[PDB]
């Protein structure tokens, strides 16, 4: 209604401000590090 000061009301977040993933991008570097870590095992099967 009509108010002079201190509306004291909560609000929802701003529309579309929560952006999200979707694009068909390549693997994360944590996965790249797991590939390299498992390679240290695979190479060792053919090495001393």
């Amino acid at each position: 209604g009509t108010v002079n000061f201190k509306p004291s009301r909560p609000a929802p977040p701003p529309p579309t401000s929560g952006q999200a993933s979707g694009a068909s991008r390549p693997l994360p570097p944590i996965a790249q590090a797991l590939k390299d870590h498992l390679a240290a095992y695979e190479l060792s099967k053919a090495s001393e």
């Binding site: 944590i30 870590h37 095992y41």
Partner: protein, 73 residues
């Protein structure tokens, strides 16, 4: 009885040193990370190969730590 509280530096994970990742209790974030690494069920059920895969997970901080860095994509 109860589970051991020691996994505080790791996470929720269906892996065991005897038979590997139990695919019936295996988490979806785990299967995700492993497919992009090119791992097959034969390797996840390899108690030898699954150990190498799991040793990386408990290193970074567990299932939670790998997820935080997976979420970058």
């Amino acid at each position: 009885g109860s589970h051991m509280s020691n996994f505080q530096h790791i996470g929720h994970v269906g892996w065991d040193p005897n038979t590997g990742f139990d695919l019936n209790n295996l988490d979806p974030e785990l299967k995700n990370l492993f497919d992009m690494c090119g791992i097959s069920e034969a390797q996840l059920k390899d108690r030898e190969t699954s150990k190498v895969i799991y040793d990386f997970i408990e290193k970074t901080g567990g299932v939670e730590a790998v997820k935080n860095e997976l979420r970058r994509q």
